[PDB]
Amino acid sequence: HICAICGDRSSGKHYGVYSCEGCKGFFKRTVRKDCLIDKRQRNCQYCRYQKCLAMGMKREAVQEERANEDMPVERILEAELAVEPVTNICQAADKQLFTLVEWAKRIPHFSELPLDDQVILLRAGWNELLIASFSHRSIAVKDGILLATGLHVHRNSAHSAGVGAIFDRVLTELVSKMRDMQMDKTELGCLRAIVLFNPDSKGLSNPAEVEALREKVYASLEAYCKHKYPEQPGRFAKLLLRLPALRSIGLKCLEHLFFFKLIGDTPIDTFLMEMLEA
Amino acid sequence: PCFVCQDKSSGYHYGVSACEGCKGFFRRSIQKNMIYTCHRDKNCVINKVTRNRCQYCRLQKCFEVGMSKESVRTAELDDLTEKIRKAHQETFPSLCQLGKYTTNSSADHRVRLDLGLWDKFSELATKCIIKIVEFAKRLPGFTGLTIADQITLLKAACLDILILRICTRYTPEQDTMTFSDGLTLNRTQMHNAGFGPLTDLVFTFANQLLPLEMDDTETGLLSAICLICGDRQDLEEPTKVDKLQEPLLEALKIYIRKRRPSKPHMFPKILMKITDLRSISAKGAERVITLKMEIPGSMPPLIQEMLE
Amino acid sequence: HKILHRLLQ
Amino acid sequence: HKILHRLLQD
DNA sequence: GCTGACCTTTGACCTAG
């Protein structure tokens, strides 16, 4: 049981002769596209090919024909670097919203998409975007969060105005999980790129391209999890699993802001006031 | 002759004269619930020299000549896959195995609530919740767990299981859903039975499940993943819940891409339907407390005990 | 929560 | 209004 | 861009009822 072409190990007969996988692929590609030979030196097309034909390989046995480069993690790396009680968090939300508008223009194909499409995609999942932002920004501190204005918010002070259950939802279902699994900035920008390219948004003009960009984000993030963490088998799936909790938190989160708006007590910045008023 | 590829026959297989290659192709396709995608016009003619080229064309020609789908009768991580397939198929009969029937109670245009369909729908809901806990038991390692944490996971995922299961019973041509006893309701009767504002979105979810082409195995695994989730509040042993759900995720991926070679992007989509399921069940949970006052009697025991 | 307990055990 | 629309305007 | 180790799919042959 030895290759009759270069003496390599063989599992069986191919094209009529005992051979290895190297001689197999070489012969197949040579037929499709039209000197001592051992495993040490099998890589002269004559000898190699001539020895394959000499040992009895049949050309008629060949049958007929049967980190990415359009959404590379390269641009997400560049993005997260490029940009990065109740009234203070609304403050930081308004400060961050400008930088979110800026963070849109750094995703490879976000600029080429249409005029309405930009505004719809951006003000459709802005709250989940910024919630992901400071949720990933709050990995260091334990039971609190860090805003975009250097403000620490936590414990009963964060729990003071009947807004502690949602704070603990963010701390338990997002912050502590991101810390426990050590999510990279790249993976963060990929998740926020998926939240960004939401094809189920209303009034979208030709949302198929949005969903396609979301496909390329899926594939590029997945291949990135293949290269960066090959030891971790389930890295892409369980980081995707973070999005359901993000939407669930963002819902009650946004409704809190809704009642807060329609009671007129909290001074809400105008740019923030827009996204709440569709 | 072979009616598919014009080759030497080996007998009448699955209803027509066929060769051994097409026989094995059809058996492998039906047994493993394969999904093929053609890279051309799906016109690719199949014969003696042009075989394969496109698997969807070959299977399509098998169904055009009249092969009977009815006649048809790594491993470490696939074991639990087959186990959950058994559990979900024995705790929820699939739509194409129910002799379904209809009713005519408030079937034209919508009303606020129909008491009778709320009654029949209530006993049906209690039944399906029982079988939901039965599906939970037969999951690998769910029994050997903290009782308070099992109650936590079931309390948190019961509505998601209900919406997913009832949305795997949808008929697009009639815009109808069918329950576990054959009771088939249209959108109007679903609204009148006690769905209300949920209806429109729930049915929406149903249509969003149609392009995914999920089978019973993928639905069972997704159900288990919604059940076994380490993000539920008030968990006493959440890390072991997450560890218990990891192999379900990996097995779901291996299975999904096992049934779809040309669509290696369906695992993130089928997994991301959970993102919508969260909001749907999140509004349904309070839809129950809106149904609290509209019923003259009271809420059935298991429904209120599992939904609050 | 009687139903859950009786069902589990 | 068009605050975001004008923020992406330039 | 070719290479080749590693995986999946096909089909001629087989056994049972």
Next chain:
DNA sequence: CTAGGTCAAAGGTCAGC
């Protein structure tokens, strides 16, 4: 005589140099 099952030998992919 036709199911389902088997496994050598075709096909394919895609880091790594």
